[PDB]
């Protein structure tokens, strides 16, 4: 099937309920995190740790420089 991309590309309102992760290599901790896809693609081998499930949007995909590797381009 398709290759799932960053949940930011499908977050149609500001937030969406989902599992999300911390990346200590990128110091994206606390209130900052990444979706299930970006933990596996953009932060592969990047000292990832489960955060929680809840209301969230992905800070990897949202980054304005477009450096997320899991966007539609
Ligand atoms: Zn993402
Ligand atoms: Zn990282
Ligand atoms: Zn990403």
Numbering used by the authors: 1657 to 1729
Sentences reproduced from the published study:
The N-end rule pathway is a proteolytic system involving the destabilization of N-terminal amino acids, known as N-degrons, which are recognized by N-recognins. The E3 ligases of the UBR subfamily recognize and degrade N-degrons through the ubiquitin-proteasome system. However, unlike other UBR proteins, UBR4, despite having only the UBR box domain, can recognize both type-1 and type-2 N-degron. Our findings suggest that the UBR box of UBR4 recognizes type-1 N-terminal arginine and type-2 N-terminal amino acids containing an aromatic ring, such as tyrosine, tryptophan, and phenylalanine through pi-interaction with two phenylalanines of the UBR box of UBR4.
First, we determined the ligand-free structure of UBR4UBR. The structure of UBR4UBR, like other UBR boxes, is composed of three α-helices and two antiparallel β-sheets. The UBR4UBR coordinates three zinc ions. One zinc ion (Zn1) is canonically coordinated by two cysteines and two histidines similar to the other UBR boxes. However, whereas two zinc ions (Zn2 and Zn3) were coordinated by six cysteines and one histidine in the structure of the UBR boxes of UBR1 and UBR2, two zinc ions were coordinated by seven cysteines in UBR4UBR. Besides differences in the residues coordinating zinc, there was also a structural difference between UBR4UBR and the UBR boxes of UBR1 and UBR2. The carboxyl group of Asp1715 and the oxygen atom between Phe1713 were conserved at the same positions in the structure of UBR4UBR as in the UBR box of UBR2. However, in the structure of UBR4UBR, there is a unique feature where the aspartic acid residue (Asp1721), which is one of the main features of N-recognins such as UBR1 and UBR2, is located far away from the ligand-binding site. In other words, in UBR4UBR, Asp1721 may not be involved in ligand-binding unlike other the UBR boxes of UBR1 and UBR2. First, as observed in other N-recognin structures, during crystallization of UBR4UBR the amino acid at the N-terminus was bound to the ligand-binding site of other UBR4UBR molecules in the apo UBR4UBR structure.
